Amino acid sequence: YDRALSIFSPDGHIFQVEYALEAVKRGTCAVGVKGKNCVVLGCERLKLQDTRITSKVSKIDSHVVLSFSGLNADSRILIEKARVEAQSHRLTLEDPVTVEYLTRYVAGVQQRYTQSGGVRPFGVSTLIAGFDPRDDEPKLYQTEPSGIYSSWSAQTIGRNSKTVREFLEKNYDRKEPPATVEECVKLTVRSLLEVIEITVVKPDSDIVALSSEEINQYVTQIE
Amino acid sequence: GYDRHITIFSPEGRLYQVEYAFKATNQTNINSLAVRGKDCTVVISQKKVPDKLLDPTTVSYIFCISRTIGMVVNGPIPDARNAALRAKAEAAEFRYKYGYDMPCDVLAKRMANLSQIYTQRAYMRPLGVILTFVSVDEELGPSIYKTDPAGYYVGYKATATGPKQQEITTNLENHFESWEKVVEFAITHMIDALGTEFSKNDLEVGVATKDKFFTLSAENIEERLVAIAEQ
Amino acid sequence: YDSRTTIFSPEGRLYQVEYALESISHAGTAIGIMASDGIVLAAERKVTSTLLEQDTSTEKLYKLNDKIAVAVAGLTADAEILINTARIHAQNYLKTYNEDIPVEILVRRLSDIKQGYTQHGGLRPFGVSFIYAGYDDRYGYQLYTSNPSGNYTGWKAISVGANTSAAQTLLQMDYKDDMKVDDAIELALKTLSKTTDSSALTYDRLEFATIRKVYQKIFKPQEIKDILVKTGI
C-alpha cells in the first residue's frame, strides 16, 4: 500500500501522499502571522555562499506572496506556474488574482500531480499570504502536497513545526490578534527563537523585507 | 531477475530472453538445408507430420515471399507465418518505393532490423524463428541469407538449420546445369547426414530460379527420389 | 522504495535522487573560484591514459555562451544533452531580447529540466552536477552549482565531485574575498593538489579555464604546464 498513489491503505488513507508530508517536515522552517491589517512571514536560513544572489519568500504578484517548505527544487517550479496564472488571470480577466484563487490554483497543481502513478507529487507545502485587490483584510493560506488548502490565522511548516505551532497556539489569540506591525513581527520573531529573515506584506501591494531585525531580537531576548 | 523475463542485460552482459528464443526454433524438431547451384538455389526441409490424421499437404514451412524470393522458417509456424506476412509486405513496399524487385539480402536486413527492435524493446518479445531467405538476385546471382532472433543476418554459400545442423554442415564442408540436379544433391546429403530415408510425404523442397521461386509438389519430389534410387 | 524515482520513502526522501548525488562523488573533482576581477574554473581529468588525446579533448569544461562556462562533474554523457540545451536556450534569449542571457536565468532553466527528470517515472535523474561561471551586468561575476535534484546555490568558491569535503575545507580557510584572478589560480591549483588521489598533479590530468576582464580562456595543455610549474606544483 506504501508504494503507490492509487492504492488506499486498509485503514483508509493513502500512504504515498502522507510520505510527501514528511518531506515537507524535513524542509526549512517557515512561519506566517496574520495581523489586523498586515501579514508577516518568517523563514529559517555556508561560509562561502554568495548571499547576494540568493529570499525564501518569493512574491507571486505585486500584492501576493508565497513562502514554502520542503524540496526547494519543486517549490521553484510550483512558484513559476503560480506566477504565470497570476498574469494570465490579469490578462483574461481585468482584476488581479484573489489570494483564495491563487492558493486554489496552486493546490490544484499539487492535487493534479497526484492523479497518476508516473508522477512524483510536489514535496512542498506553500504558505501563501497577501491581500485581495482593493481590500484591507489580511489573508494567509497553506497548501499541502495532497492538494488540501486551508486558511490560517498563523501557521508554521517544516523543520520544528509542532514545537513552533504550539508556541503560536498559546501566544496567539483569535479574539486578541496583534493589531500592530511590531506586535505581529515580535510574535513571528519570538516564534522563530523557540528553535532571522522577516517579510511584511501590507495592503495595496506594499511588500517590504525587513532589515535590522536585531532590535526585535534584542528586545524579545531581554524579556 | 527482470533480465530473465524481459530483454535487458544480465550481470553477465547477455540477453537471456533472446537466447531462449533460439531454443524455441528447435521445438518443431525440423531441420533444413539450402545450397547454391550455378544458376539456381535449392532449399530442403523435413516434413515430420507425424500424426496420421494431420494432412501433410498443409504442413509446409516454406513460403513464397515474392516472385523471386522464398524463405524457410525453423521454429513454431505461428511465428513463421507472422514473419512471412512481414516479409511478404516489405518486399512489395520496396518495389513500390524504389521501383525494382526486393533483393534477398536487403529483405534479411529489414527483417533482422525488425528483430533488433524486439531484442531492445522491453515490451516486445523476440519472434523466436530462424528465417532462411533463398533467391537468385539479378546482380549477385544465387544467394542464401539466414536471419535469427538475435537480429543477425549472414550470407551463406550453403547452410543447414535445426537440431542436427552441425551434422549436416560438417558434411557440406567436407564436400566443399538444371535445378533438378541440385535437388538430388541436396536430398542425398540430407539422407547421408541424417541417415533417414525419405518419401514424398516426409519431404518438402523449394527451388529459386532466375524467373521465380516455386515449391515442388508431392509428386515432383517423388520423381527426384526415384532418380536418386537409380544411382 | 528506490526501484523508481517517483516514490517517496517513509522518511520522505528520494533514494533514486540520492544515488545520483552519490554517483557524482566518484567523478573527477571540479573546483570553481570567484575572484574580485574574474572567475576561475578547474577540473581533475580522472579518465587518464597516455594514449588519450590530452589536447582537444575538453570533457569537464564547456562553453555555453560568451561570458559563461560550466565545469562538469559526473556522467559526461548526460552533460552534453543539457549543455546543448543551455546553448540553445542562451541564444534564444539573445534572439529574443538582443541581450546576453543572465547567468541566473540559464542556471534556473537547467535546474528545472533536471528537476523534471526526478518527477517522471520513465526518466532517471541526470547523474551530473555543473559549476556555472559567468558575467552579466545585473550581478557581474557570479558562480553557481547545480545538483541532480535540480536545486542550485550561489557560491564564492565551490568544489564538486570526488573529495568535495576535503577541497571545500581548504577553500574556507584560504579564501579571501579580496583576491585577484591570479591568486584564485594558485588557490585552485593548490586545492586540487592536496585533494587528488594521484601521487602528483600533472598537466595531462588537469583542465582549466578562466573568465576575467570579458574574455573566457580555456587553457591549452601547453600553458597549463607553464602555470603548474609557476605555482611550484
Binding site: - | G13, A122, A150 | V47
Partner: protein, 247 residues
C-alpha cells in the same frame, strides 16, 4: 499506460545497472582496435563466424558513415547496424542538407553518442550493447579517432582497443605508438596487435581493415570538377591484407 518506468536506474553505490552490464557485453565481444597515424587512421577487427560456410564479405563490421569517416564496433552487431543506419541518416539531415558538406568527426560522434545516451534514460529500450571506434578526417581538425561507449561517453584516442583483448592489445599499442607513425607503419602495428588477440586462424579473410588516409579519386566514380575530390575511407580487400601479412 501513459508511461513506462526507466529500465536504467542508479544503484545504491551510485552506478547505473544496465550501463555496466552493457559494457560487459562489449568486453565479452570480439576485439577491435584503431590507431591514429600522422597521415591517416586505421581501424581493424577480426570476423568470428558461426560456420565456415558463411560468406565473409557479408560480415562487414567496419562500415562507412561518410566518405571521410568510418566506424568499427565490438559487441552486438544488430545494435551497431541500427546505429550506423541512423548515423548515416543523421549526417545528412543535421549537417549536409544544412551546410552542404559532410559533418566533422567530432560532431558526428557527438550525435551518435546522443542517440546512445537517450537509450540510457528510457522505459522501453535497454542501452545499446556496443562501443564504436569512429575514425575520420576533418579539413580543420585533421585525422581523429574516437571511442564511444554504451553510456554515450566518447573520448578521443591516439590508439585504442575494445573487446576481449582490449587490455592486452591496449598495453601492446602503448609500447608501439609514437607521434611519428606513418600510416603504413600503423597498419603493420594494427595487424600485429590483432594477431595476439585473435584466436585460431589469422589471414585476410578472418580480418578486415579500413584506413582513413589520402584521397582515392579512383573510388569517386566520376571525373571532372577537381574541387570535388574522392573519399578517404578505404576498406582493404582480403587480397591486400594477405599481402601485408606476409611482409
Amino acid at each position: 499506460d501513459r508511461y513506462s518506468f526507466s529500465l536504467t536506474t542508479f544503484s545504491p553505490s551510485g552506478k547505473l545497472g544496465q550501463i555496466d552490464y552493457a559494457l560487459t557485453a562489449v568486453k565479452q565481444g570480439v576485439t577491435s582496435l584503431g590507431i591514429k597515424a600522422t597521415n591517416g587512421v586505421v581501424i581493424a577487427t577480426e570476423k568470428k563466424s558461426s560456420s565456415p560456410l558463411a560468406m565473409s564479405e557479408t560480415l562487414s563490421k567496419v562500415s562507412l558513415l561518410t566518405p571521410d569517416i568510418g566506424a568499427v564496433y565490438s559487441g552486438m552487431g544488430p545494435d551497431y547496424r541500427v546505429l550506423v543506419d541512423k548515423s548515416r541518416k543523421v549526417a545528412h539531415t543535421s549537417y549536409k542538407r544544412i551546410y552542404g558538406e559532410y559533418p566533422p568527426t567530432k560532431l558526428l560522434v557527438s550525435e551518435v553518442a546522443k542517440i546512445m545516451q537517450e537509450a540510457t534514460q528510457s522505459g522501453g529500450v535497454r542501452p545499446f550493447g556496443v562501443s564504436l571506434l569512429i575514425a575520420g578526417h576533418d579539413e580543420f581538425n585533421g585525422f581523429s579517432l574516437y571511442q564511444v561507449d554504451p553510456s554515450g561517453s566518447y573520448f578521443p584516442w591516439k590508439a585504442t582497443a575494445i573487446g576481449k583483448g582490449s587490455v592486452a592489445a591496449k598495453t601492446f599499442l602503448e609500447k608501439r605508438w609514437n607521434d611519428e607513425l606513418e600510416l603504413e607503419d600503423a597498419i603493420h602495428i594494427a595487424l600485429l596487435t590483432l594477431k595476439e588477440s585473435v584466436e585460431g586462424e589469422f589471414n585476410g579473410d578472418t580480418i578486415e581493415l579500413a584506413i582513413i588516409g589520402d584521397e582515392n579519386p579512383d573510388l569517386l566514380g566520376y571525373t571532372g570538377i577537381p574541387t570535388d575530390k574522392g573519399p578517404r575511407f578505404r576498406k582493404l580487400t582480403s587480397q591486400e591484407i594477405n599481402d601485408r601479412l606476409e611482409a
